[PDB]
């Protein structure tokens, strides 16, 4: 179903996956603003937007230092370790949302972050490298 | 209603001149009567007014020389007016007044204003101020001599008016009673005649009666050719 | 303190208040005539008391602006009055005076005719070693008149007292006039004549003493 | 700590009607399904139905489609993900065989194959029905008896005897007291009247130091008994 | 219940032991899906298995499930003592009722047997004032189920106001039960003593007490 | 059993931030022509279809006494009174002696005074006079008097192409935030919302700088709303959301005017010239039988905090005029109406009622706006009489404290903050950011 942007926010996290592009697309333009408002409190909207700018370009390139880029859901090859959440699928999928999620994993998630890419990426591309020579 | 004056006629300088107004046709008590005078080459004057609560207000130009009360027992107004000079000479008058609330707002802000105004009026007493004395009349009757006119002649007397009637009731038509003449001695002078048909001499009798209120001199002349 | 008015007889009138009312008026107009009581024509800016005719009508106080003006439709020889304005309004606090009177005078009246009558002195007052010679113009309009004095076709000039003329019932005027002789001098002239002329119109009445 | 409790056991004439209630915390009331399964003494356990808290759709076991009607209270939200709901279910033309043990479960999952699944089950709810009039119990005290001779311990209780409605509860020293304490399960006697007994065992040089009191709690009678258990013992291996 | 289960399986202390559930056509495995509940007697049951083979949260790996074409099993492994309760299996689909089977009853062999501990107990005075009187033997902690209680007045059997519950499942792994016998005043005095005799399956306990004492 | 992380950019999930919204200026009002407005100057087209996303079993934790949206809307206003107030024309040389005199009434308070103003040149000097109402100091005390603000702060006049009718002013969220709204009909104002919406604009809201008396608000649909920062504490805010409206309708009826006198080289001040009619000051009504009904109405739903307590109010405390007024702007000239005998019901019923209920009111042109980086402002007068109609949906009100548990509990009236005035319309919406990026254990692995 599409319900909206943030509609499966309640749904189940399987069922909020299917609505992951409609999410994705309100984090970036909100058509544009046609003359500009310009004048003394126009900076405070400047900021605001350039920061939303940086914010979106950190997690592109959070994710190119991934193997995630350009698609939205993406698969990776680190192994779910069993001291976060200690959970089974449809234990999750099927009885959790996304909100109730990020709750468990915040604990853990700066070095799930730092294992996606440090052991990840940096060693596949390097093995990528040295593999397409011989 | 009726409203009817009554004068001394004369007052001397540093007096008190004193006026009285006899009502009729209704109550005194249930209504508010004010005074009107009028000096000669002056317009109306306002002097003062009494209520129906015996409470009075005067006109600040009278110098609190005036002063009004009431008389519920005689049904009769008062009106007394010290320290009175040769201006104060005037025909006083005696009105009623009718309340008039002019609303133009809220009443609780006070957004309005009372505009005194008075329906009745009277004719009005004369009362002449001067330091000389009065004088009675001199009366005497001008024999008629082919237009057939009968009158009498009121030579000198002081002050004004003086009242000229023609057997009460019995001559009302041909009655013309000229305006009085200031002599240059300060005594004034008038003619009352009237037009006699010349059939009617020999055989009716004609008086003429006159009336000077400040000093006593009724006195009926009768005419005869 | 009177301000004039001249107004064909007819046509209405239309007299303007004296004082310019400041806020929320309520205007009285009243009618003085020499020697009668002051009547209330139009109370409360348009109200009429019993008796008052509808010739006279008040303008009401209506927004702002508007000038308090009494209109008299069709003007009579009867109307020629005092006219007081007795202005009240909110922004002037009590008003003690009745403002300045508006003498009304109609014209386009038709003309009358001086009659004249003269009265020799009396035998009482011949024996009172006085004579006075009354001469009684009545009748006629306007008040414009000469009175004059002549002694067997001689102008007297001394010993004149004329009033000024004003109109009675008539709505015409009437003058008096007063020769003051003595007894000897009374039948000193054979005839006296007292001449008056109005509009022109000289008319002449003479007495001799017998 | 997803802990769902019912409604408390009651007894009931035949041909009336009850209503259990079902009152949860700990989770999103409107979330999973509210199941209902009865057990009775005849046909084992068998499934009454489920009715959905958000939706209001229900599934009703076609046996009880007639006198069992399911109803459910909106939630109310204490925290984003906990919220306190409620769930009732009324049954008419009570009969015999459907006296015994009702219970309200919540569902397994909020998606998938299995979802209304009971997964959470509550206390239970006991539900007699007879024309038997509700008769209050006579609680009697037990003289102590020896458990062991060398070690020294009395074994002292309280008797429950004579009383219709089955459920009944006994604690000592209002709850304070929790080591040691057996209670047995209760009789059916000829007449139809229910008796159990209650023993707590002691140390036999605690009886100075420290009081036992029973408290039996009948709620379909509403009578509370306090009953002192008399430390004179009678056993002749613990006067020793 | 068309859901025939297996009537009563026993198994070895630290081995397995596999329950069975099948039915008709029309209420069994193929298209349906069948779970499994522990349902301790008057207690609340628990989930254990639930779509043929999948496991309840918190659930050890010792419990497995499978489906046939005709029948579907519960296999128990690693055999605990707390593990001797009945199980019943359901056989639902997705948008229906749960079916609940006949049920089955798992004994768990291999245990140090109990001794079981049998205590009587004389009427108080308080029910001497009622004119009433009931003996009490409570018996409890024994590991067999099967109790046999007999009263005897001044050793002679008595038939009349006895009354022996079932034995009940204790906390503690063991087995309980009590016997009542309600005996008249008359009956209270005209006798020397009285003997609750409850005869074990390898023993005999029995306890003696005195209307004088 | 078996699986591996999988990144998800896209997840429905929030976390509270803090942020700075746009505006929009409705159509731009293109009917009006006149680009002198405050929200006009730099906000946003309307986006004629808005998009309001229900979200479904979701419940959010408000607290519209914490909301940033009222802090950034009141520091938008103040910020704006200064930018508006900068380019006009300053009354600094008016700082002379003023000769003054009471109003004519030759037998309500507006004084007559007269100046020695600056005339088109400096050189030369003439004389002015006009009407100041009763803003000034006695200086030293026909009696010299001062223009009130020589004292302290300086004097602005308020530009007279600039017009104080408020416009619908609604925030918009930026890229990677959302406004969650609370539909909860009655709602806590603190506290978890059992049902959310989400968007991007809020509603249409008014900026109406008032006190006591909320005007132009929105009304809660079902029953009154009384909603507590905290109800034991006394030094709190109680906001009072009306089911329906209260006609109010102020005016000014005395037919004034304005004077343009010329002060320096190319400013012209305007002054309240010769009133010409009467003379009246400034009043409000509000019917009888609907504020009536309110006050019962809202009577009987403070019973509900309070089960055995009667409950009664009495007018604001005193002294400072601006706390203790029912301030507000008509057309132009600030209204501080009394509102004594509104609050000072149960002993009233005098004349079977007053109909229309009337309360006077005082006009003030010389403002300090909660201090907003000083200065003052002069309103220019409009000539002629103004007439302003408004509803009131909402109340400020204060408890007393003290030894006041043993009979009864007052509730008077307040303000003085005008954060409360926006709390009134923002406290059903929360600003969140977007948390895209989720990681969650799945069944897949690459290569
Ligand atoms: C907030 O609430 C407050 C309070 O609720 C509101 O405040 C009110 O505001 C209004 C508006 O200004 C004020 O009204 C003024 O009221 C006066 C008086 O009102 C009355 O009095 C009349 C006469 O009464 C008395 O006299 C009679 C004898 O004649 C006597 O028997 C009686 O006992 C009493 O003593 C009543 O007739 C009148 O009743 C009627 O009219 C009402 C309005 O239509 C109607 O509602 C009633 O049902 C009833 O039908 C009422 O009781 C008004 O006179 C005044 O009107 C004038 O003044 C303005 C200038 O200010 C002028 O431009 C107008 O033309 C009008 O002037 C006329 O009347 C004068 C005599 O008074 C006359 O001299 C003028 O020439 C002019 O006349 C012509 O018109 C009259 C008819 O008016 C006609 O007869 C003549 O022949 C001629 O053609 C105002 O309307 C309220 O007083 C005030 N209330 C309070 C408590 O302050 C406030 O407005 C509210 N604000 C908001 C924003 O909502
Ligand atoms: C917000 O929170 C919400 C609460 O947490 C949350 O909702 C949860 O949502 C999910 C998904 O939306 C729900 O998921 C599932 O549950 C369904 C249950 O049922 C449908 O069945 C109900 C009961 O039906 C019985 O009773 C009816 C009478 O009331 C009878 O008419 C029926 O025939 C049926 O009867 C049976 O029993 C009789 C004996 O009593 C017997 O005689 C008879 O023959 C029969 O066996 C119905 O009431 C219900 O009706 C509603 O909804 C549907 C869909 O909207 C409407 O069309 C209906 O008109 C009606 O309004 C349903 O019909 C399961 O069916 C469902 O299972 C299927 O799908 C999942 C995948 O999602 C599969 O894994 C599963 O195997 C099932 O697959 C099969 O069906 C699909 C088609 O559905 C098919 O494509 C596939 O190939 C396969 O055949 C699923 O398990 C969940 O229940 C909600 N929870 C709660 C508590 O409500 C919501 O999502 C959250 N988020 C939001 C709102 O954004
Ligand atoms: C502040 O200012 C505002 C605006 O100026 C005022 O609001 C107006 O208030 C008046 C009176 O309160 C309203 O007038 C009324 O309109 C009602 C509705 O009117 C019509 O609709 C009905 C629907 O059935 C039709 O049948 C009817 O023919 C109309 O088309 C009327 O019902 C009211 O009538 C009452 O009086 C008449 C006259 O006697 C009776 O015949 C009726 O039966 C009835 O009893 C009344 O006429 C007006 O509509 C309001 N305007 C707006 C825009 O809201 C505030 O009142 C004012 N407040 C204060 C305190 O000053
Ligand atoms: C759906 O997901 C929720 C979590 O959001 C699951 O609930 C959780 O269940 C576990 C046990 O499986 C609970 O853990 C326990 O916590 C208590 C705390 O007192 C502790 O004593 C226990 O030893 C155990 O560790 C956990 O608290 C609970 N969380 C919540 C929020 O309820 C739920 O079981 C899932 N439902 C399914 C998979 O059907
Ligand atoms: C310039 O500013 C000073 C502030 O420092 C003004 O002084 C203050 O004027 C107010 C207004 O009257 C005084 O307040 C009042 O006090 C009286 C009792 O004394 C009370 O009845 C009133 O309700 C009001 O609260 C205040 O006391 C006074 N403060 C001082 C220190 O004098 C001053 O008036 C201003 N104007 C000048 C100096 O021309
Ligand atoms: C919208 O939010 C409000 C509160 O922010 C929700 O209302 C609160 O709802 C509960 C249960 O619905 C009310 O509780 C009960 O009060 C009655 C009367 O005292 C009592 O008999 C009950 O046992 C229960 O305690 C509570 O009073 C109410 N809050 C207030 C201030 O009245 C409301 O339910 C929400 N809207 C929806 C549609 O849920
Ligand atoms: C606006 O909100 C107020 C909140 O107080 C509403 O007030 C009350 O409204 C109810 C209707 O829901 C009135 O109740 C009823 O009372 C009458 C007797 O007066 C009875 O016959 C009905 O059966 C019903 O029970 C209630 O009296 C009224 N006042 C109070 C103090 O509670 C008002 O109705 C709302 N108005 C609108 C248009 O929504
Ligand atoms: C409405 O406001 C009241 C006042 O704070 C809330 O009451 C408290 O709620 C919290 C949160 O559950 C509890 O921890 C407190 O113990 C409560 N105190 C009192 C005195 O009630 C109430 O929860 C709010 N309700 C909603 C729906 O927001
Ligand atoms: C929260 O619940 C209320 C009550 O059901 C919803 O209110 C209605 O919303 C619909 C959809 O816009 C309107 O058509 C109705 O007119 C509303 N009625 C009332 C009485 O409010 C509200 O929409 C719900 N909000 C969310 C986000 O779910
Ligand atoms: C305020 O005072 C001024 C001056 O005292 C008033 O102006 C005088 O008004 C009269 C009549 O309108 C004029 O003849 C004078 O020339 C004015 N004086 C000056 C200096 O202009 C003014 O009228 C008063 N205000 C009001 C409302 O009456
Ligand atoms: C999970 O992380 C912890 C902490 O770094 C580590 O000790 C453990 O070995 C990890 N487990 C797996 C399966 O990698
Ligand atoms: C203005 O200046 C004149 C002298 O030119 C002076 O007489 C007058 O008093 C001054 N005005 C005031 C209000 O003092
Ligand atoms: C509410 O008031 C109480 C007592 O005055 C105080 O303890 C508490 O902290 C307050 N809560 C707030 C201000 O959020
Ligand atoms: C309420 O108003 C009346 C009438 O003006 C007044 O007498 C009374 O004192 C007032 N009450 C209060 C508490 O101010």
């Known amino acids: 179903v599409f319900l909206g942007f943030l509609g499966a926010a309640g749904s189940t996290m399987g069922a909020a996956s299917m609505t992951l592009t409609v999410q994705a697309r309100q984090l970036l333009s909100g058509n544009f603003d046609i003359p500009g408002p310009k004048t003394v409190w126009g900076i405070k909207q400047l900021q605001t937007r350039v920061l939303a700018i940086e914010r979106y370009l950190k997690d592109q390139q959070l994710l190119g230092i991934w193997g995630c880029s350009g698609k939205l859901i993406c698969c990776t090859a680190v192994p779910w370790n069993a001291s976060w959440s200690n959970k089974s699928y449809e234990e999750i999928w099927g009885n959790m949302t996304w909100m109730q999620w990020d709750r468990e994993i915040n604990n853990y998630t700066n070095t799930i972050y730092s294992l996606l890419e440090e052991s990840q990426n940096q060693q596949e591309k390097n093995e990528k490298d040295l593999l397409a020579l011989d | 209603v009726q409203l009817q004056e009554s004068g001394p006629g004369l007052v001397r300088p540093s007096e008190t001149l004193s006026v009285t107004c006899i009502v009729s046709?209704?109550?005194?008590?249930?209504?508010?009567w004010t005074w009107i005078r009028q000096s000669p080459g002056k317009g109306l004057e306002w002097i003062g007014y009494?209520?129906?609560?015996?409470?009075?207000t005067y006109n600040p130009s009278l110098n609190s020389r005036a002063v009004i009360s009431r008389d519920t027992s005689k049904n009769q107004l008062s009106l007394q007016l010290r320290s009175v000079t040769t201006a104060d000479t005037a025909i006083y008058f005696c009105?009623?007044?009718?309340?008039?609330?002019?609303?133009?707002?809220?009443?609780?802000?006070?957004?309005?204003?009372?505009?005194?105004?008075?329906?009745?009026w009277g004719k009005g007493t004369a009362v002449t101020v001067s330091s000389a004395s009065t004088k009675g009349p001199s009366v005497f009757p001008l024999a008629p001599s082919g237009t057939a006119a009968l009158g009498c002649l009121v030579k000198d007397y002081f002050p004004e008016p003086v009242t000229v009637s023609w057997n009460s009731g019995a001559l009302t038509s041909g009655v013309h009673t000229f305006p009085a003449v200031l002599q240059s001695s300060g005594l004034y002078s008038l003619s009352s005649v009237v037009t006699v048909p010349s059939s009617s001499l020999g055989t009716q009798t004609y008086i003429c009666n006159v009336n000077h209120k400040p000093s006593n001199t009724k006195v009926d002349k009768k005419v005869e050719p | 303190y009177v301000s004039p008015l001249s107004v064909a007889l007819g046509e209405t009138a239309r007299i303007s208040c004296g004082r310019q009312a400041l806020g929320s008026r309520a205007v009285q107009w009243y009618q003085h005539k020499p020697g009668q009581a002051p009547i209330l024509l139009i109370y409360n800016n348009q109200d009429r008391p019993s008796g008052i005719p509808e010739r006279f009508s008040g303008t009401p106080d209506i927004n702002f602006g508007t000038t308090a003006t009494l209109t008299i439709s069709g003007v009579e020889v009867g109307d020629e009055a005092d006219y007081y304005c007795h202005m009240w309004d909110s922004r002037s606090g009590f008003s003690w005076s009745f403002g300045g009177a508006t003498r009304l005078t109609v014209l386009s009246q038709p003309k009358a005719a001086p009659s004249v009558t003269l009265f020799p002195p009396s035998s009482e007052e011949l024996q009172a070693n006085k004579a006075t010679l009354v001469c009684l113009i009545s009748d006629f309009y306007p008040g414009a008149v000469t009175v004059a004095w002549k002694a067997d076709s001689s102008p007297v000039k001394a010993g004149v007292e004329t009033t000024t003329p004003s109109k009675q019932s008539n709505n015409k005027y009437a003058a008096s006039s007063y020769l003051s002789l003595t007894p000897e001098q009374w039948k000193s002239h054979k005839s006296y004549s007292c001449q008056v002329t109005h509009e022109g119109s000289t008319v002449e009445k003479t007495v001799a003493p017998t | 700590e997803g802990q769902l409790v019912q409604s408390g056991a009651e007894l009931k004439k035949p041909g009336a009607s009850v209503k259990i209630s079902c009152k949860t915390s700990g989770y999103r009331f409107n979330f999973y399904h509210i199941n209902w399964i009865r057990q009775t003494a005849g046909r084992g356990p068998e499934w009454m139905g489920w009715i959905s808290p958000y939706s209001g759709d229900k599934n009703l076991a076609p046996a009880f489609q007639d006198r069992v009607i399911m109803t459910t209270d909106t939630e109310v939200p204490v925290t984003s993900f906990t919220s306190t709901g409620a769930a009732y279910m009324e049954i008419r033309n009570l009969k015999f065989d459907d006296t015994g043990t009702y219970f309200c479960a919540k569902g397994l999952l909020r998606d998938g194959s299995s979802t209304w699944l009971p997964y959470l089950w509550g206390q239970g709810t006991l539900l007699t029905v007879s024309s038997a009039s509700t008769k209050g119990p006579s609680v009697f005290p037990l003289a102590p008896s020896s458990k062991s001779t060398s070690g020294g311990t009395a074994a002292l209780g309280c008797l429950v005897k004579d009383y219709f409605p089955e459920p009944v509860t006994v604690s000592w020293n209002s709850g304070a007291l929790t080591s040691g304490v057996h209670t047995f399960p209760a009789v059916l006697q000829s007449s139809g009247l229910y008796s159990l007994s209650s023993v707590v065992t002691v140390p036999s040089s605690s009886l100075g130091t420290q009081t036992y009191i029973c408290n039996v709690n009948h709620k379909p009678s509403n009578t509370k008994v306090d009953k002192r258990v008399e430390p004179k013992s009678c056993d002749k291996g613990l006067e020793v | 219940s068309v859901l025939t289960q297996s009537a009563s399986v026993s198994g070895s202390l630290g081995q397995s032991v596999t329950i069975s559930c099948t039915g008709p056509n029309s209420v069994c495995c193929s298209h349906k899906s069948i779970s499994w509940y522990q349902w301790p007697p008057g207690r609340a049951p628990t989930l254990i298995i639930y779509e043929d083979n999948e496991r309840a949260p918190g659930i050890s790996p010792r419990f497995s499930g499978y489906k046939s074409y005709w029948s579907a099993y519960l296999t128990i492994s690693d055999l605990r003592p707390e593990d001797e309760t009945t199980y019943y299996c359901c056989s639902y689909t997705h948008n229906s009722g749960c079916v609940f089977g006949t049920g089955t009853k798992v004994s768990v062999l291999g245990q140090s047997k109990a001794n079981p501990s049998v205590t009587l107990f004389p009427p108080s005075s308080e029910e001497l004032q009622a004119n009433k009187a009931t003996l009490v033997c409570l018996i409890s902690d024994f590991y067999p189920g099967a109790v046999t209680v007999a009263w005897k007045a001044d050793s002679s059997p008595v038939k009349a106001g006895v009354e022996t519950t079932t034995p009940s499942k204790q906390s503690n792994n063991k087995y309980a039960a009590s016997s009542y016998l309600s005996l008249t005043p008359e009956q209270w005095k005209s006798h020397r003593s009285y003997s609750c005799q409850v005869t074990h399956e390898g023993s005999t306990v029995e306890k003696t007490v005195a209307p004088t004492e | 059993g078996n699986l591996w992380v999988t990144v998800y950019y896209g997840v429905p999930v929030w976390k509270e931030a803090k942020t700075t919204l746009f505006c929009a200026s409705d159509a731009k009002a293109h009917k009006e022509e006149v680009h002198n407005i405050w929200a006009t100057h730099a906000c946003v087209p309307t986006d004629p279809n808005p998009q309001e996303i229900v979200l479904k079993n979701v419940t959010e934790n408000f607290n519209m006494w914490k909301n940033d949206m009222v802090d950034q809307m009141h520091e938008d206003i103040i910020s704006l009174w200064d930018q508006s107030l900068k380019p006009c024309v300053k009354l600094t040389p008016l700082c002379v002696t003023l000769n003054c005199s009471d109003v004519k009434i030759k037998g309500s308070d507006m004084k007559n005074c007269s100046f020695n103003t600056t005339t088109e040149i400096t050189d030369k000097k003439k004389k002015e006079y006009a009407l100041f109402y009763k803003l000034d100091v006695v200086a030293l005390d026909s009696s010299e008097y001062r223009l009130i603000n020589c004292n302290t702060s300086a004097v602005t006049q308020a530009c007279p192409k600039v017009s104080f009718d408020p416009i619908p002013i609604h925030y918009c969220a930026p890229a990677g935030y959302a406004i969650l709204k609370c539909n909860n009909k009655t709602f806590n104002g603190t506290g978890p919302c059992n049902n959310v919406s989400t968007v991007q604009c809020t509603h249409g809201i008014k900026p109406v700088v008032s006190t006591q008396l909320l005007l132009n608000g929105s009304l809660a649909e079902e029953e009154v709303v009384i909603r507590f920062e905290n109800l034991t504490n006394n030094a709190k805010i109680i906001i009072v959301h009306l089911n329906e409206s209260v006609e109010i309708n102020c005016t000014r009826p005395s037919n004034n005017t304005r004077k343009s006198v010329r002060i320096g080289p190319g400013q012209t001040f305007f002054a309240t010239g010769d009133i010409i009619g009467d003379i009246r000051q400034a009043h409000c009504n509000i019917s009888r039988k609907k504020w009536n009904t309110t006050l019962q109405r809202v009577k009987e739903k403070l019973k509900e905090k309070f089960p055995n307590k009667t409950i009664q109010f009495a007018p604001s405390s005193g002294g400072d005029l601006e706390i203790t007024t029912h301030s507000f702007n008509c057309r132009g000239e600030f209204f501080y109406c009394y509102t004594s005998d509104l609050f000072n019901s149960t002993y009233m019923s005098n004349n079977t009622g007053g109909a229309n209920i009337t309360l006077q009111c005082r006009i003030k042109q010389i403002i300090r706006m909660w201090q907003g980086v000083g200065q003052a402002m002069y309103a220019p007068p409009i000539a002629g009489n103004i007439t302003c109609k408004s509803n009131i949906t909402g109340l400020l009100l204060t408890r007393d404290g003290g030894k006041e548990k043993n009979d009864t509990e007052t509730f008077r009236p307040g303000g003085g903050d005008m954060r409360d005035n926006w709390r009134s319309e923002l406290y059903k919406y929360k600003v969140v950011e977007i948390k895209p990026l989720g990681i969650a254990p799945d069944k897949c692995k690459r290569r």
């Open positions: 009494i209520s129906d609560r015996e409470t009075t």
């Open positions: 046709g209704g109550s005194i008590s249930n209504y508010y």
């Open positions: 009105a009623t007044a009718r309340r008039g609330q002019r609303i133009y707002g809220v009443v609780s802000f006070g957004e309005f204003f009372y505009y005194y105004y008075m329906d009745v």
